[PDB]
Design a protein around this ligand. Structure first.
Ligand SMILES: COc1cc(/C=C/C(=O)/C=C(O)/C=C/c2ccc(O)c(OC)c2)ccc1O
Ligand SMILES: COc1cc(/C=C/C(=O)O)ccc1O
Ligand SMILES: COc1cc(/C=C\C(=O)O)ccc1O
Ligand SMILES: COc1cc(/C=C\C(=O)O)ccc1O
Ligand code: NA
Ligand code: NA
Lengths: 117, 116, 117, 116
Protein backbone atom coordinates (compact mmCIF):
# COMPACT_ATOMS: atom_id res chain seq x y z
CA UNK A 1 0.00 0.00 0.00
CA UNK A 2 2.58 2.48 1.16
CA UNK A 3 5.45 2.39 -1.21
CA UNK A 4 3.95 1.43 -4.58
CA UNK A 5 0.42 2.19 -5.73
CA UNK A 6 -1.15 1.89 -9.19
CA UNK A 7 -4.22 3.74 -10.42
CA UNK A 8 -5.90 3.15 -13.78
CA UNK A 9 -8.59 5.27 -15.46
CA UNK A 10 -10.72 4.74 -18.57
CA UNK A 11 -10.80 7.80 -20.86
CA UNK A 12 -13.66 6.39 -23.00
CA UNK A 13 -16.13 5.85 -20.15
CA UNK A 14 -14.91 8.46 -17.65
CA UNK A 15 -14.52 5.83 -14.97
CA UNK A 16 -11.96 3.89 -13.01
CA UNK A 17 -10.62 0.95 -15.01
CA UNK A 18 -11.80 -1.91 -12.79
CA UNK A 19 -10.30 -5.41 -12.38
CA UNK A 20 -7.30 -4.61 -14.61
CA UNK A 21 -4.37 -7.01 -14.11
CA UNK A 22 -1.07 -5.41 -13.09
CA UNK A 23 2.28 -7.23 -13.03
CA UNK A 24 5.40 -5.80 -11.41
CA UNK A 25 8.93 -6.98 -12.19
CA UNK A 26 12.36 -6.06 -10.83
CA UNK A 27 15.57 -6.30 -12.84
CA UNK A 28 17.89 -8.96 -11.39
CA UNK A 29 21.69 -8.96 -11.28
CA UNK A 30 21.75 -10.92 -14.55
CA UNK A 31 19.69 -8.16 -16.24
CA UNK A 32 16.57 -10.35 -16.47
CA UNK A 33 13.09 -9.34 -15.29
CA UNK A 34 12.16 -11.19 -12.12
CA UNK A 35 8.53 -11.33 -10.97
CA UNK A 36 8.08 -8.96 -8.03
CA UNK A 37 4.35 -8.55 -7.33
CA UNK A 38 0.96 -8.54 -9.07
CA UNK A 39 -2.67 -7.72 -8.45
CA UNK A 40 -5.91 -6.38 -9.92
CA UNK A 41 -7.37 -2.88 -9.76
CA UNK A 42 -10.35 -2.44 -7.45
CA UNK A 43 -13.71 -0.84 -8.16
CA UNK A 44 -11.96 2.50 -7.59
CA UNK A 45 -9.31 1.70 -10.22
CA UNK A 46 -6.67 1.41 -7.50
CA UNK A 47 -4.23 -1.32 -6.62
CA UNK A 48 -2.72 -1.23 -3.15
CA UNK A 49 -0.80 -3.76 -1.16
CA UNK A 50 1.63 -4.74 -3.91
CA UNK A 51 4.69 -4.53 -1.67
CA UNK A 52 6.17 -3.34 1.61
CA UNK A 53 8.86 -0.95 2.75
CA UNK A 54 11.14 -3.89 3.51
CA UNK A 55 10.67 -5.65 0.15
CA UNK A 56 10.74 -2.54 -2.06
CA UNK A 57 14.47 -1.96 -2.25
CA UNK A 58 16.52 0.00 -4.78
CA UNK A 59 16.16 -1.36 -8.25
CA UNK A 60 14.82 -0.97 -11.74
CA UNK A 61 11.14 -1.89 -11.76
CA UNK A 62 8.63 -2.54 -14.51
CA UNK A 63 4.90 -2.11 -13.99
CA UNK A 64 2.96 -3.84 -16.78
CA UNK A 65 -0.76 -3.09 -17.01
CA UNK A 66 -2.88 -5.56 -18.99
CA UNK A 67 -4.80 -3.02 -21.02
CA UNK A 68 -5.47 -5.42 -23.90
CA UNK A 69 -7.63 -7.78 -21.81
CA UNK A 70 -9.45 -4.77 -20.38
CA UNK A 71 -10.46 -3.39 -23.77
CA UNK A 72 -11.25 -6.78 -25.27
CA UNK A 73 -13.73 -7.45 -22.44
CA UNK A 74 -15.53 -4.22 -23.39
CA UNK A 75 -15.75 -5.25 -27.07
CA UNK A 76 -12.89 -3.07 -28.24
CA UNK A 77 -9.88 -4.31 -30.18
CA UNK A 78 -7.14 -2.03 -28.85
CA UNK A 79 -3.73 -1.11 -30.22
CA UNK A 80 -1.37 -1.95 -27.37
CA UNK A 81 -0.49 -5.27 -25.87
CA UNK A 82 -0.19 -3.54 -22.50
CA UNK A 83 0.85 -0.26 -20.93
CA UNK A 84 4.11 -0.49 -19.06
CA UNK A 85 6.39 1.85 -17.19
CA UNK A 86 9.99 1.20 -16.33
CA UNK A 87 11.79 3.24 -13.67
CA UNK A 88 14.59 3.28 -11.13
CA UNK A 89 13.19 3.32 -7.57
CA UNK A 90 14.70 4.52 -4.26
CA UNK A 91 18.03 5.75 -5.70
CA UNK A 92 18.16 8.52 -3.10
CA UNK A 93 16.45 6.58 -0.32
CA UNK A 94 12.89 5.26 0.10
CA UNK A 95 10.10 7.07 -1.70
CA UNK A 96 6.42 6.45 -2.23
CA UNK A 97 5.38 5.91 -5.83
CA UNK A 98 1.97 6.27 -7.42
CA UNK A 99 1.83 5.13 -11.04
CA UNK A 100 -1.25 6.49 -12.77
CA UNK A 101 -2.38 5.34 -16.21
CA UNK A 102 -5.11 6.82 -18.39
CA UNK A 103 -6.36 4.46 -21.06
CA UNK A 104 -7.87 4.78 -24.53
CA UNK A 105 -8.05 2.09 -27.19
CA UNK A 106 -5.19 3.57 -29.28
CA UNK A 107 -3.47 5.69 -26.66
CA UNK A 108 -2.33 5.75 -23.06
CA UNK A 109 -0.78 8.29 -20.74
CA UNK A 110 1.13 7.57 -17.60
CA UNK A 111 2.51 9.69 -14.90
CA UNK A 112 4.28 9.15 -11.61
CA UNK A 113 3.72 10.92 -8.34
CA UNK A 114 6.75 10.45 -6.10
CA UNK A 115 6.70 11.59 -2.48
CA UNK A 116 9.17 11.47 0.39
CA UNK A 117 7.80 9.62 3.46
CA UNK B 1 -0.89 28.17 -43.31
CA UNK B 2 2.36 29.30 -41.77
CA UNK B 3 1.95 30.94 -38.40
CA UNK B 4 -0.91 28.96 -36.79
CA UNK B 5 -1.76 25.31 -37.42
CA UNK B 6 -4.13 23.00 -35.55
CA UNK B 7 -3.89 19.20 -35.57
CA UNK B 8 -6.44 16.87 -34.00
CA UNK B 9 -6.11 13.13 -33.32
CA UNK B 10 -8.66 10.53 -32.21
CA UNK B 11 -7.39 8.28 -29.39
CA UNK B 12 -10.34 5.87 -29.69
CA UNK B 13 -10.00 5.00 -33.37
CA UNK B 14 -6.27 5.69 -33.77
CA UNK B 15 -6.82 8.13 -36.59
CA UNK B 16 -6.82 11.79 -37.49
CA UNK B 17 -9.96 13.51 -36.25
CA UNK B 18 -11.51 14.57 -39.55
CA UNK B 19 -14.14 17.28 -40.15
CA UNK B 20 -13.73 18.76 -36.70
CA UNK B 21 -14.83 22.39 -36.42
CA UNK B 22 -12.27 24.80 -35.04
CA UNK B 23 -12.82 28.44 -34.13
CA UNK B 24 -10.07 30.87 -33.19
CA UNK B 25 -10.72 34.03 -31.20
CA UNK B 26 -8.59 36.93 -30.05
CA UNK B 27 -9.13 38.71 -26.75
CA UNK B 28 -10.38 42.28 -27.28
CA UNK B 29 -9.44 45.33 -25.18
CA UNK B 30 -12.74 44.92 -23.30
CA UNK B 31 -11.88 41.27 -22.47
CA UNK B 32 -14.44 39.85 -24.90
CA UNK B 33 -13.57 37.16 -27.45
CA UNK B 34 -13.45 38.50 -31.01
CA UNK B 35 -13.74 36.07 -33.94
CA UNK B 36 -10.38 35.67 -35.66
CA UNK B 37 -10.34 32.57 -37.87
CA UNK B 38 -11.99 29.17 -38.27
CA UNK B 39 -12.08 26.02 -40.34
CA UNK B 40 -12.55 22.25 -40.29
CA UNK B 41 -9.82 19.66 -39.99
CA UNK B 42 -8.81 17.85 -43.18
CA UNK B 43 -8.58 14.13 -43.83
CA UNK B 44 -5.19 14.30 -42.12
CA UNK B 45 -6.69 15.94 -39.02
CA UNK B 46 -4.98 19.21 -39.88
CA UNK B 47 -6.17 22.74 -40.27
CA UNK B 48 -3.88 25.14 -42.12
CA UNK B 49 -4.43 28.58 -43.64
CA UNK B 50 -6.05 30.09 -40.56
CA UNK B 51 -4.08 33.33 -40.63
CA UNK B 52 -1.09 35.16 -42.04
CA UNK B 53 2.03 36.54 -40.40
CA UNK B 54 0.77 40.11 -40.81
CA UNK B 55 -2.59 39.37 -39.17
CA UNK B 56 -1.24 37.21 -36.33
CA UNK B 57 0.03 39.79 -33.85
CA UNK B 58 0.85 39.39 -30.16
CA UNK B 59 -2.33 38.88 -28.11
CA UNK B 60 -4.30 36.29 -26.21
CA UNK B 61 -5.88 33.69 -28.48
CA UNK B 62 -8.43 30.96 -27.90
CA UNK B 63 -8.62 27.91 -30.11
CA UNK B 64 -11.96 26.17 -29.57
CA UNK B 65 -12.31 22.67 -30.96
CA UNK B 66 -15.88 21.31 -31.26
CA UNK B 67 -15.18 17.89 -29.82
CA UNK B 68 -18.76 17.34 -28.72
CA UNK B 69 -20.08 17.34 -32.29
CA UNK B 70 -17.27 15.04 -33.34
CA UNK B 71 -18.10 12.37 -30.71
CA UNK B 72 -21.83 12.75 -31.30
CA UNK B 73 -21.26 11.97 -34.97
CA UNK B 74 -19.53 8.75 -33.86
CA UNK B 75 -22.38 7.84 -31.51
CA UNK B 76 -20.16 8.16 -28.47
CA UNK B 77 -21.27 10.14 -25.43
CA UNK B 78 -18.69 12.76 -24.54
CA UNK B 79 -17.89 14.73 -21.43
CA UNK B 80 -16.72 18.10 -22.73
CA UNK B 81 -18.72 20.76 -24.59
CA UNK B 82 -15.52 21.47 -26.53
CA UNK B 83 -11.78 21.60 -26.06
CA UNK B 84 -10.36 25.08 -25.84
CA UNK B 85 -6.80 26.18 -25.68
CA UNK B 86 -5.97 29.70 -24.49
CA UNK B 87 -2.50 31.18 -24.88
CA UNK B 88 -0.53 34.37 -25.47
CA UNK B 89 1.09 34.37 -28.90
CA UNK B 90 3.25 36.92 -30.66
CA UNK B 91 5.00 38.92 -28.02
CA UNK B 92 8.70 38.74 -28.85
CA UNK B 93 7.28 39.14 -32.37
CA UNK B 94 5.88 36.49 -34.75
CA UNK B 95 6.42 32.81 -34.04
CA UNK B 96 5.20 29.54 -35.59
CA UNK B 97 2.55 27.70 -33.55
CA UNK B 98 1.11 24.22 -33.88
CA UNK B 99 -1.70 23.45 -31.46
CA UNK B 100 -2.15 19.69 -31.23
CA UNK B 101 -5.03 17.95 -29.50
CA UNK B 102 -5.52 14.28 -28.71
CA UNK B 103 -9.17 13.41 -28.11
CA UNK B 104 -10.99 10.82 -26.05
CA UNK B 105 -14.64 10.94 -24.98
CA UNK B 106 -13.87 11.83 -21.35
CA UNK B 107 -10.37 13.28 -21.75
CA UNK B 108 -8.23 15.41 -23.98
CA UNK B 109 -4.63 16.44 -24.13
CA UNK B 110 -3.20 19.47 -25.87
CA UNK B 111 0.35 20.52 -26.55
CA UNK B 112 1.94 23.40 -28.39
CA UNK B 113 4.86 22.99 -30.73
CA UNK B 114 6.48 26.36 -31.24
CA UNK B 115 9.24 26.16 -33.85
CA UNK B 116 11.70 28.47 -35.67
CA UNK C 1 -16.51 17.74 -1.57
CA UNK C 2 -19.06 15.28 -2.83
CA UNK C 3 -20.25 16.43 -6.17
CA UNK C 4 -17.31 18.30 -7.71
CA UNK C 5 -13.65 17.62 -7.01
CA UNK C 6 -10.53 18.89 -8.80
CA UNK C 7 -7.11 17.27 -8.77
CA UNK C 8 -3.99 18.77 -10.33
CA UNK C 9 -0.62 17.07 -10.93
CA UNK C 10 2.76 18.38 -12.08
CA UNK C 11 4.33 16.27 -14.84
CA UNK C 12 7.73 18.02 -14.56
CA UNK C 13 8.27 17.34 -10.85
CA UNK C 14 6.18 14.19 -10.39
CA UNK C 15 4.19 15.80 -7.62
CA UNK C 16 0.81 17.22 -6.78
CA UNK C 17 0.44 20.78 -8.08
CA UNK C 18 -0.01 22.61 -4.78
CA UNK C 19 -1.83 25.91 -4.09
CA UNK C 20 -3.12 26.19 -7.68
CA UNK C 21 -6.10 28.56 -8.03
CA UNK C 22 -9.26 27.04 -9.49
CA UNK C 23 -12.30 29.06 -10.60
CA UNK C 24 -15.66 27.48 -11.43
CA UNK C 25 -18.35 29.18 -13.51
CA UNK C 26 -21.87 28.21 -14.55
CA UNK C 27 -23.56 29.41 -17.73
CA UNK C 28 -26.54 31.66 -16.93
CA UNK C 29 -29.81 31.98 -18.84
CA UNK C 30 -28.33 34.91 -20.78
CA UNK C 31 -25.44 32.68 -21.94
CA UNK C 32 -22.89 34.51 -19.77
CA UNK C 33 -20.46 32.84 -17.34
CA UNK C 34 -21.52 33.43 -13.76
CA UNK C 35 -19.07 32.83 -10.90
CA UNK C 36 -20.00 29.59 -9.14
CA UNK C 37 -17.17 28.61 -6.77
CA UNK C 38 -13.39 28.85 -6.37
CA UNK C 39 -10.57 27.52 -4.25
CA UNK C 40 -6.93 26.43 -4.14
CA UNK C 41 -5.44 22.95 -4.41
CA UNK C 42 -4.09 21.49 -1.18
CA UNK C 43 -0.72 19.90 -0.50
CA UNK C 44 -2.17 16.74 -2.07
CA UNK C 45 -3.10 18.62 -5.26
CA UNK C 46 -6.80 18.25 -4.41
CA UNK C 47 -9.59 20.76 -4.10
CA UNK C 48 -12.68 19.67 -2.21
CA UNK C 49 -15.59 21.57 -0.82
CA UNK C 50 -16.30 23.64 -3.92
CA UNK C 51 -20.05 23.00 -3.84
CA UNK C 52 -22.90 20.95 -2.44
CA UNK C 53 -25.54 18.58 -3.75
CA UNK C 54 -28.15 21.32 -3.38
CA UNK C 55 -26.16 24.03 -5.18
CA UNK C 56 -24.76 21.85 -7.98
CA UNK C 57 -27.76 21.73 -10.28
CA UNK C 58 -27.97 20.92 -13.98
CA UNK C 59 -25.98 23.31 -16.07
CA UNK C 60 -22.98 23.98 -18.24
CA UNK C 61 -19.94 24.49 -16.01
CA UNK C 62 -16.44 25.76 -16.64
CA UNK C 63 -13.52 24.82 -14.42
CA UNK C 64 -10.58 27.17 -15.02
CA UNK C 65 -7.24 26.19 -13.49
CA UNK C 66 -4.65 28.96 -13.12
CA UNK C 67 -1.72 27.06 -14.54
CA UNK C 68 0.13 30.19 -15.66
CA UNK C 69 0.64 31.51 -12.10
CA UNK C 70 1.71 28.03 -11.02
CA UNK C 71 4.48 27.76 -13.61
CA UNK C 72 5.60 31.36 -13.25
CA UNK C 73 6.16 30.82 -9.51
CA UNK C 74 8.49 27.92 -10.38
CA UNK C 75 10.50 30.08 -12.80
CA UNK C 76 8.91 28.70 -15.95
CA UNK C 77 7.26 30.80 -18.63
CA UNK C 78 4.47 28.49 -19.78
CA UNK C 79 2.40 28.41 -22.96
CA UNK C 80 -1.18 28.48 -21.68
CA UNK C 81 -3.03 31.19 -19.86
CA UNK C 82 -4.89 28.48 -17.95
CA UNK C 83 -6.27 24.99 -18.35
CA UNK C 84 -10.03 24.90 -18.52
CA UNK C 85 -12.71 22.31 -19.02
CA UNK C 86 -16.28 22.98 -20.02
CA UNK C 87 -18.99 20.36 -19.55
CA UNK C 88 -22.69 19.75 -19.04
CA UNK C 89 -23.37 18.40 -15.53
CA UNK C 90 -26.27 16.34 -14.12
CA UNK C 91 -28.21 15.97 -17.41
CA UNK C 92 -29.42 12.53 -16.35
CA UNK C 93 -29.61 13.26 -12.63
CA UNK C 94 -26.96 14.03 -9.99
CA UNK C 95 -23.47 12.65 -10.54
CA UNK C 96 -20.15 13.04 -8.82
CA UNK C 97 -17.43 14.64 -10.92
CA UNK C 98 -13.67 14.49 -10.49
CA UNK C 99 -11.77 16.75 -12.89
CA UNK C 100 -8.12 15.74 -13.08
CA UNK C 101 -5.47 17.85 -14.80
CA UNK C 102 -1.88 16.91 -15.57
CA UNK C 103 0.35 19.90 -16.23
CA UNK C 104 3.48 20.59 -18.26
CA UNK C 105 4.76 23.99 -19.36
CA UNK C 106 3.59 23.56 -22.99
CA UNK C 107 0.96 20.88 -22.54
CA UNK C 108 -1.88 19.74 -20.34
CA UNK C 109 -4.17 16.73 -20.17
CA UNK C 110 -7.49 16.56 -18.47
CA UNK C 111 -9.88 13.81 -17.78
CA UNK C 112 -13.15 13.40 -15.95
CA UNK C 113 -14.22 10.61 -13.67
CA UNK C 114 -18.00 10.60 -13.35
CA UNK C 115 -19.75 8.33 -10.87
CA UNK C 116 -23.36 7.73 -9.87
CA UNK C 117 -23.99 8.32 -6.13
CA UNK D 1 9.70 5.52 -44.39
CA UNK D 2 6.25 4.27 -45.26
CA UNK D 3 5.00 1.58 -42.94
CA UNK D 4 6.38 2.63 -39.53
CA UNK D 5 7.07 6.18 -38.37
CA UNK D 6 7.87 7.50 -34.89
CA UNK D 7 7.31 11.09 -33.77
CA UNK D 8 8.41 12.51 -30.44
CA UNK D 9 7.42 15.84 -28.85
CA UNK D 10 8.74 17.66 -25.77
CA UNK D 11 5.97 18.97 -23.49
CA UNK D 12 8.38 21.04 -21.37
CA UNK D 13 9.94 23.10 -24.15
CA UNK D 14 7.06 22.95 -26.65
CA UNK D 15 9.24 21.54 -29.39
CA UNK D 16 10.08 18.40 -31.30
CA UNK D 17 12.25 16.07 -29.25
CA UNK D 18 15.39 16.01 -31.37
CA UNK D 19 18.19 13.42 -31.36
CA UNK D 20 16.18 10.92 -29.36
CA UNK D 21 17.32 7.32 -29.76
CA UNK D 22 14.66 4.85 -30.81
CA UNK D 23 15.00 1.08 -31.02
CA UNK D 24 12.42 -1.25 -32.53
CA UNK D 25 12.24 -4.93 -31.67
CA UNK D 26 10.11 -7.83 -32.85
CA UNK D 27 9.01 -10.65 -30.56
CA UNK D 28 10.69 -13.94 -31.50
CA UNK D 29 9.09 -17.41 -31.35
CA UNK D 30 10.85 -17.96 -28.01
CA UNK D 31 9.34 -14.73 -26.61
CA UNK D 32 12.65 -12.85 -26.70
CA UNK D 33 12.98 -9.39 -28.27
CA UNK D 34 14.88 -9.46 -31.56
CA UNK D 35 16.42 -6.24 -32.90
CA UNK D 36 14.45 -4.97 -35.88
CA UNK D 37 15.27 -1.32 -36.61
CA UNK D 38 16.55 1.84 -34.95
CA UNK D 39 17.41 5.48 -35.48
CA UNK D 40 17.41 8.95 -33.94
CA UNK D 41 14.69 11.55 -34.29
CA UNK D 42 15.34 14.40 -36.72
CA UNK D 43 15.12 18.13 -36.12
CA UNK D 44 11.37 17.73 -36.62
CA UNK D 45 11.17 15.02 -33.93
CA UNK D 46 10.50 12.40 -36.59
CA UNK D 47 12.05 9.10 -37.44
CA UNK D 48 11.32 7.68 -40.88
CA UNK D 49 12.91 4.91 -42.93
CA UNK D 50 12.81 2.31 -40.16
CA UNK D 51 11.50 -0.52 -42.31
CA UNK D 52 9.89 -1.48 -45.60
CA UNK D 53 6.52 -3.01 -46.41
CA UNK D 54 8.15 -6.35 -47.24
CA UNK D 55 10.06 -6.53 -43.95
CA UNK D 56 7.21 -5.30 -41.72
CA UNK D 57 5.10 -8.42 -41.29
CA UNK D 58 2.43 -9.19 -38.69
CA UNK D 59 3.98 -9.69 -35.25
CA UNK D 60 4.40 -8.08 -31.87
CA UNK D 61 6.68 -5.05 -31.96
CA UNK D 62 8.26 -2.93 -29.27
CA UNK D 63 9.29 0.65 -29.90
CA UNK D 64 11.66 1.78 -27.14
CA UNK D 65 12.35 5.49 -26.89
CA UNK D 66 15.39 6.52 -24.81
CA UNK D 67 13.71 9.33 -22.91
CA UNK D 68 16.11 9.13 -19.99
CA UNK D 69 19.10 10.18 -22.09
CA UNK D 70 17.05 12.97 -23.64
CA UNK D 71 16.11 14.52 -20.25
CA UNK D 72 19.61 13.99 -18.88
CA UNK D 73 20.98 15.99 -21.80
CA UNK D 74 18.62 18.82 -20.78
CA UNK D 75 19.71 18.62 -17.13
CA UNK D 76 16.27 17.53 -16.02
CA UNK D 77 15.80 14.56 -13.71
CA UNK D 78 13.41 12.05 -15.24
CA UNK D 79 11.29 9.26 -13.86
CA UNK D 80 11.31 6.64 -16.61
CA UNK D 81 14.24 4.56 -17.90
CA UNK D 82 12.62 4.85 -21.33
CA UNK D 83 9.22 4.93 -22.97
CA UNK D 84 8.25 1.73 -24.69
CA UNK D 85 5.26 0.99 -26.80
CA UNK D 86 4.28 -2.63 -27.46
CA UNK D 87 1.68 -3.55 -30.08
CA UNK D 88 0.64 -6.16 -32.63
CA UNK D 89 1.07 -4.86 -36.17
CA UNK D 90 0.42 -6.47 -39.53
CA UNK D 91 -2.26 -9.05 -39.04
CA UNK D 92 -4.96 -8.24 -41.57
CA UNK D 93 -1.88 -7.59 -43.72
CA UNK D 94 0.30 -4.45 -43.98
CA UNK D 95 -0.89 -1.19 -42.48
CA UNK D 96 0.64 2.27 -41.98
CA UNK D 97 1.63 3.08 -38.39
CA UNK D 98 2.68 6.31 -36.74
CA UNK D 99 3.71 5.96 -33.11
CA UNK D 100 3.61 9.37 -31.45
CA UNK D 101 4.96 10.15 -28.01
CA UNK D 102 4.62 13.28 -25.92
CA UNK D 103 7.30 13.55 -23.24
CA UNK D 104 7.51 15.13 -19.81
CA UNK D 105 10.04 14.31 -17.10
CA UNK D 106 7.57 12.35 -14.95
CA UNK D 107 4.96 11.45 -17.58
CA UNK D 108 4.53 10.40 -21.15
CA UNK D 109 1.66 9.83 -23.50
CA UNK D 110 1.66 7.70 -26.62
CA UNK D 111 -0.88 7.28 -29.37
CA UNK D 112 -0.98 5.34 -32.60
CA UNK D 113 -2.26 6.79 -35.83
CA UNK D 114 -3.04 3.95 -38.19
CA UNK D 115 -4.02 5.27 -41.62
CA UNK D 116 -4.92 3.94 -45.10
C1 LIG E 1 -5.51 14.24 -16.84
O1 LIG E 1 -4.22 13.69 -16.57
C2 LIG E 1 -4.08 12.47 -15.96
C3 LIG E 1 -4.55 12.28 -14.67
C4 LIG E 1 -4.40 11.04 -14.06
C5 LIG E 1 -4.88 10.80 -12.68
C6 LIG E 1 -3.97 10.61 -11.73
C7 LIG E 1 -4.34 10.37 -10.33
O2 LIG E 1 -5.49 10.04 -10.06
C8 LIG E 1 -3.31 10.52 -9.29
C9 LIG E 1 -3.50 10.20 -8.00
O3 LIG E 1 -4.67 9.74 -7.57
C10 LIG E 1 -2.41 10.41 -7.02
C11 LIG E 1 -2.47 11.57 -6.38
C12 LIG E 1 -1.55 12.06 -5.33
C13 LIG E 1 -1.51 13.43 -5.11
C14 LIG E 1 -0.68 13.96 -4.12
C15 LIG E 1 0.10 13.11 -3.35
O4 LIG E 1 0.90 13.66 -2.40
C16 LIG E 1 0.05 11.74 -3.57
O5 LIG E 1 0.82 10.90 -2.80
C17 LIG E 1 0.48 10.75 -1.42
C18 LIG E 1 -0.78 11.21 -4.55
C19 LIG E 1 -3.79 9.99 -14.74
C20 LIG E 1 -3.32 10.19 -16.03
C21 LIG E 1 -3.47 11.44 -16.64
O6 LIG E 1 -3.01 11.63 -17.91
C1 LIG F 1 0.82 11.03 -27.67
O1 LIG F 1 0.24 12.13 -26.98
C2 LIG F 1 -0.12 13.25 -27.68
C3 LIG F 1 0.15 13.32 -29.03
C4 LIG F 1 -0.20 14.45 -29.76
C5 LIG F 1 0.13 14.43 -31.20
C6 LIG F 1 0.98 15.32 -31.71
C7 LIG F 1 1.29 15.26 -33.15
O2 LIG F 1 0.77 14.36 -33.84
O3 LIG F 1 2.08 16.09 -33.63
C8 LIG F 1 -0.83 15.53 -29.15
C9 LIG F 1 -1.12 15.51 -27.78
C10 LIG F 1 -0.79 14.39 -27.02
O4 LIG F 1 -1.06 14.33 -25.69
C1 LIG G 1 -16.94 12.13 -36.49
O1 LIG G 1 -16.74 13.24 -37.36
C2 LIG G 1 -16.64 12.99 -38.70
C3 LIG G 1 -15.75 12.04 -39.18
C4 LIG G 1 -15.68 11.79 -40.55
C5 LIG G 1 -14.72 10.79 -41.08
C6 LIG G 1 -14.95 9.48 -41.02
C7 LIG G 1 -16.15 8.94 -40.35
O2 LIG G 1 -17.23 8.88 -40.98
O3 LIG G 1 -16.04 8.54 -39.17
C8 LIG G 1 -16.49 12.49 -41.44
C9 LIG G 1 -17.40 13.45 -41.01
C10 LIG G 1 -17.51 13.73 -39.66
O4 LIG G 1 -18.39 14.66 -39.21
C1 LIG H 1 18.15 16.77 -25.32
O1 LIG H 1 18.54 16.04 -26.47
C2 LIG H 1 19.13 16.72 -27.49
C3 LIG H 1 18.54 17.86 -28.02
C4 LIG H 1 19.17 18.55 -29.05
C5 LIG H 1 18.55 19.76 -29.64
C6 LIG H 1 18.58 20.95 -29.03
C7 LIG H 1 19.19 21.11 -27.70
O2 LIG H 1 20.43 21.28 -27.61
O3 LIG H 1 18.44 21.11 -26.70
C8 LIG H 1 20.39 18.11 -29.56
C9 LIG H 1 21.03 16.98 -29.06
C10 LIG H 1 20.44 16.26 -28.03
O4 LIG H 1 21.04 15.15 -27.52
NA1 NA I 1 21.95 6.20 -4.25
NA1 NA J 1 -32.24 15.46 -18.47
Amino acid sequence: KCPLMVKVLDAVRGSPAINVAVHVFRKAADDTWEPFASGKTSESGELHGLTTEEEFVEGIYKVEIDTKSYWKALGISPFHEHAEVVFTANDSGPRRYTIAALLSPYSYSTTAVVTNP
